[PDB]
Amino acid sequence: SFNSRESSLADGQPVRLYQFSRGAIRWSYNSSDRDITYQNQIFRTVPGGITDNGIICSGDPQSDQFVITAPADLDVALLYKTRSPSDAIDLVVYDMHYGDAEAAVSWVGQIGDVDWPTVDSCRITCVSEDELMDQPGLTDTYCRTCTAIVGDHRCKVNLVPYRVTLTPQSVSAWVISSGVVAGYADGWFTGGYVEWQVDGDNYDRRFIEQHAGADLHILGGTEGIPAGGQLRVYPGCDGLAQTCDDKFSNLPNFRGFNAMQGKSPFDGDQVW
Amino acid sequence: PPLGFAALEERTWTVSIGTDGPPVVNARIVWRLQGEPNLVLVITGNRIIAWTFAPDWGDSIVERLSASTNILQSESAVTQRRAMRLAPRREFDANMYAVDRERQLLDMTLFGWGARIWALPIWPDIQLLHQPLAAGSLGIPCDTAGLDFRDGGLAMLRGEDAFTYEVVEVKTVTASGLDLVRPVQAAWGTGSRLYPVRTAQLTEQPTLTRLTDTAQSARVSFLVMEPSAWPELMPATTYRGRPVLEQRPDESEDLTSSYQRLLSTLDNGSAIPRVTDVAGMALPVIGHRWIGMGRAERSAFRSLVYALRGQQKPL
Amino acid sequence: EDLTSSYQRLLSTLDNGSAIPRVTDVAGMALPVIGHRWIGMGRAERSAFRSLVYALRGQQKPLWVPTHADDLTLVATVSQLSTALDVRNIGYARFANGRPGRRDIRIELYDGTVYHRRILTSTELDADTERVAIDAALGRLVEPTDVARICFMALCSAASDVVEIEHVTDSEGVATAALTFKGVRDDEF
Amino acid sequence: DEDSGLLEITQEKTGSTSLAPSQLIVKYIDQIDGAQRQIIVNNNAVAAS
Amino acid sequence: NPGQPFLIRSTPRGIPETVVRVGRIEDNFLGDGKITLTVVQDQFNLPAT
Numbered sequence: 044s045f046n047s048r049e050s051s052l053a054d055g056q057p058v059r060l061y062q063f064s065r066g067a068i069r070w071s072y073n074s075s076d077r078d079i080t081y082q083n084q085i086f087r088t089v090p091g092g093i094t095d096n097g098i099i100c101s102g103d104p105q106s107d108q109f110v111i112t113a114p115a116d117l118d119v120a121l122l123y124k125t126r127s128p129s130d131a132i133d134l135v136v137y138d139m140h141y142g143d144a145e146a147a148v149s150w151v152g153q154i155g156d157v158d159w160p161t162v163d164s165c166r167i168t169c170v171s172e173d174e175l176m177d178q179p180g181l182t183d184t185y186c187r188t189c190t191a192i193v194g195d196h197r198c199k200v201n202l203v204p205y206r207v208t209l210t211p212q213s214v215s216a217w218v219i220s221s222g223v224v225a226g227y228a229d230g231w232f233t234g235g236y237v238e239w240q241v242d243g244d245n246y247d248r249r250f251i252e253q254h255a256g257a258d259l260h261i262l263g264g265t266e267g268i269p270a271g272g273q274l275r276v277y278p279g280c281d282g283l284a285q286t287c288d289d290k291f292s293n294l295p296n297f298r299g300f301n302a303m304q305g306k307s308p309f310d311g312d313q314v315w
Numbered sequence: 316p317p318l319g320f321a322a323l324e325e326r327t328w329t330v331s332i333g334t335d336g337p338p339v340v341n342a343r344i345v346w347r348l349q350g351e352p353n354l355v356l357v358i359t360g361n362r363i364i365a366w367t368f369a370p371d372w373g374d375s376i377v378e379r380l381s382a383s384t385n386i387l388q389s390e391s392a393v394t395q396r397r398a399m400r401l402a403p404r405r406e407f408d409a410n411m412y413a414v415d416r417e418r419q420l421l422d423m424t425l426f427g428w429g430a431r432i433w434a435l436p437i438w439p440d441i442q443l444l445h446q447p448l449a450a451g452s453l454g455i456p457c458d459t460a461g462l463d464f465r466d467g468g469l470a471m472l473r474g475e476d477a478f479t480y481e482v483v484e485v486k487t488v489t490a491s492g493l494d495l496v497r498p499v500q501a502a503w504g505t506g507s508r509l510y511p512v513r514t515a516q517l518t519e520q521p522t523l524t525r526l527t528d529t530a531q532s533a534r535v536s537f538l539v540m541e542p543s544a545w546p547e548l549m550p551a552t553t554y555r556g557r558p559v560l561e562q563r564p565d566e567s568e569d570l571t572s573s574y575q576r577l578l579s580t581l582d583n584g585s586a587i588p589r590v591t592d593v594a595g596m597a598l599p600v601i602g603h604r605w606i607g608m609g610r611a612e613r614s615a616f617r618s619l620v621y622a623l624r625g626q627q628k629p630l
Numbered sequence: 631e632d633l634t635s636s637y638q639r640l641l642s643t644l645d646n647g648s649a650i651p652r653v654t655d656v657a658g659m660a661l662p663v664i665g666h667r668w669i670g671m672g673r674a675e676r677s678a679f680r681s682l683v684y685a686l687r688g689q690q691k692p693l694w695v696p697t698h699a700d701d702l703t704l705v706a707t708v709s710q711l712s713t714a715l716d717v718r719n720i721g722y723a724r725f726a727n728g729r730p731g732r733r734d735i736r737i738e739l740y741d742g743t744v745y746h747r748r749i750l751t752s753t754e755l756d757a758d759t760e761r762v763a764i765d766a767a768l769g770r771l772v773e774p775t776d777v778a779r780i781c782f783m784a785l786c787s788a789a790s791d792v793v794e795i796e797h798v799t800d801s802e803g804v805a806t807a808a809l810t811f812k813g814v815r816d817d818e819f
Numbered sequence: 820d821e822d823s824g825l826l827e828i829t830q831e832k833t834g835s836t837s838l839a840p841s842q843l844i845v846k847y848i849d850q851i852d853g854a855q856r857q858i859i860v861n862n863n864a865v866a867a868s
Numbered sequence: 869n870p871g872q873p874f875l876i877r878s879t880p881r882g883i884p885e886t887v888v889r890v891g892r893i894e895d896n897f898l899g900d901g902k903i904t905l906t907v908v909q910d911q912f913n914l915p916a917t
């Protein structure tokens with residue numbers, strides 16, 4: 044009846060539904076003045092209303108953004124206030140008419156940017172998957188180092204055995220200290236990242252600038268790190284062939300070119 | 316708080332909830348004891364102040380029902396309608412006075428509460444009790460025919476003065492009384508006013524005009540932030556599967572008619588214009604007026620207005 | 631000419647969509663607006679008014695603008711050393727409990743002597759009477775029968791810079807003008 | 820259609836015919852040798868005008 | 869959707885049934901209710917000879 048209602052000249056009762064999902068956690072909002080139950084999901088009513096600006100599909104990712112307006116107290120947007128969540132918040136938009144149990148999917152995407160122009164409002168800019176095609180695609184260089192992030196699909200190195208679970212001893216503005224890591228050689232954890240559970244099955248990740256003794260340096264500060272929460276810390280690969288094989292014994296998968304050639308052409312001037 | 320509990324002893328405290336405090340009740344009381352996980356008693360709710368000023372009835376009170384319906388028509392005289400708001404926003408306009416002990420109270424309330432939710436009684440729905448209400452009684456037997464009473468709503472008894480009042484929660488409507496969940500703590504005899512209560516907010520702060528040392532007339536306007544459910548009924552007569560308006564309009568004020576047309580594209584230059592009929596069809600415009608002189612007619616008109624949903628539903 | 635008052639607020643960001651609006655108090659403070667009119671009937675009064683207008687410099691220079699209402703009325707005599715003024719319960723404690731605006735008092739005794747006081751905190755005592763406090767002393771024992779009005783004071787400044795001085799007869803004659811004052815947070819805070 | 824879901828059509832863009840090219844040169848690379856090659860496409864009707 | 873061809877007819881404008889291909893899309897489901905489309909005449913075809 045959704046299509047029939049759209050074609051109807053007197054039963055038009057538009058209502059737009061938004062679904063923000065991050066793994067196992069979902070946030071449901073509706074633009075009407077009362078909650079709507081759809082597919083066993085109830086959508087909350089935001090005091091003040093939630094509205095968008097329209098959907099544009101012109102083939103230009105930079106121009107085809109989707110804008111959401113909502114109060115500054117919106118739960119899903121509140122997360123971005125202090126620090127952007129590590130994972131992207133997928134957004135799905137449905138369209139349905141009051142009194143009908145059928146809805147149609149209109150827009151699908153993820154959060155691109157969030158800002159709070161006024162205390163009584165917040166503007167969210169949503170981007171589609173098409174915008175991820177503007178970055179280069181070379182991803183190849185003939186250099187000495189590995190040119191591969193430890194654990195990627197190219198290194199084929201399993202980090203689960205190297206996982207270390209610990210409770211930090213003391214947390215400071217920029218340094219998190221723990222005695223368990225003090226037993227490892229300096230720089231063992233350099234290049235690794237720290238992941239811990241925020242809510243449900245979602246974890247927030249932070250990279251490590253440097254590891255020295257019992258003190259760990261966290262890039263961008265330690266804000267948001269629970270002082271007593273359980274933390275998982277993985278090591279980091281420098282990328283050198285000696286580092287790759289002595290520590291991880293992954294030399295066969297070494298993607299770097301240590302000593303094949305640095306400059307030698309076959310159309311130079313004098314070989315000697 | 317530190318006080319031992321005797322064995323097989325139940326100590327029932329008296330949780331007294333006051334009337335002064337922050338608007339949003341976000342309380343987390345923790346009952347912490349040794350060798351037992353924290354058992355936090357969470358109290359949640361909101362604090363509101365009721366509007367207890369009687370506006371004089373010399374000038375008619377205007378009730379406004381507004382809804383949103385953006386309609387776009389093509390070159391031909393065809394319209395598609397997209398009624399937006401299902402529950403129309405209700406606005407009330409009235410004038411009031413304050414002379415003895417009400418002027419200062421009004422000034423203090425306006426300065427303090429300001430732009431915050433009220434509990435506006437429905438003045439047009441005034442009602443007088445037929446029998447005295449005993450203190451502590453559960454249920455108020457009163458007429459509920461064509462009144463703005465809804466299950467789980469609010470009611471507000473009133474007396475001669477502003478102070479004499481009390482708000483109760485109505486559970487359901489039995490067509491003869493108002494089921495209540497909390498007993499009334501004070502008895503008012505015949506003559507006390509009964510008012511339906513709906514949440515309202517001051518759309519614009521009234522401009523107070525001083526009449527004398529202690530006297531101020533105000534033009535208060537209120538908007539209700541709750542849906543106003545009401546049955547939607549069309550006229551009994553039907554023609555070609557559509558309603559027919561059989562009501563005869565009042566002729567007290569002379570009314571005219573016009574033939575609105577999509578007669579744009581006049582294309583006036585400098586020599587002579589030329590108008591082209593895009594559709595060549597005339598849609599007449601008609602005005603209507605009526606007089607209620609009764610509760611039933613007013614209820615029927617309200618149901619008709621709700622059924623119309625603005626311009627969406629034709630007839 | 632009858633005059634009224636209003637409570638202007640920075641109540642923007644109403645944020646009305648389609649379902650329901652929601653208004654948020656950015657500051658939660660009310661600044662009253664008061665109108666004023668006067669008659670000269672003399673050269674000295676007109677010169678004084680012109681000097682006052684020049685001193686105001688528009689909205690720049692503020693000055694207290696007492697009202698002339700009768701909001702508070704005594705119900706029990708107060709000793710000179712007592713600071714527990716008793717007034718009829720008008721919901722003051724629930725609404726006014728110490729904050730900028732509506733926390734100043736002018737006794738304005740019958741004889742003509744006026745005492746300026748400063749409210750400190752109001753406590754509810756009964757459904758009909760209260761025990762609002764003051765800053766320091768009263769000056770003497772005053773019975774309820776010896777009070778005219780209270781006329782809450784409030785710091786205010788002009789709301790419109792333009793001032794119209796309507797000359798009627800002559801410099802030594804009658805004149806009319808209108809002034810409007812609006813509350814403003816000033817005086818070191 | 821106007822009665823079938825069309826509201827208003829504003830732009831017409833009649834265009835022009837006296838302009839536009841009469842000869843088109845297409846340059847392509849042959850993968851057998853990798854040497855630049857080109858072909859010529861002609862519009863006799865437009866060319867005459 | 870982009871690239872989808874469809875027919876348009878408008879007798880008052882003197883435009884007979886014409887086949888056009890969708891271009892830029894800008895729709896407004898909530899608020900104004902305006903769905904505006906930019907279309908071009910269907911003249912795309914790749915000959916096999």
Ligand SMILES: [Fe+3]
Binds near residue numbers: 280287
């Ligand atoms: Fe590696």
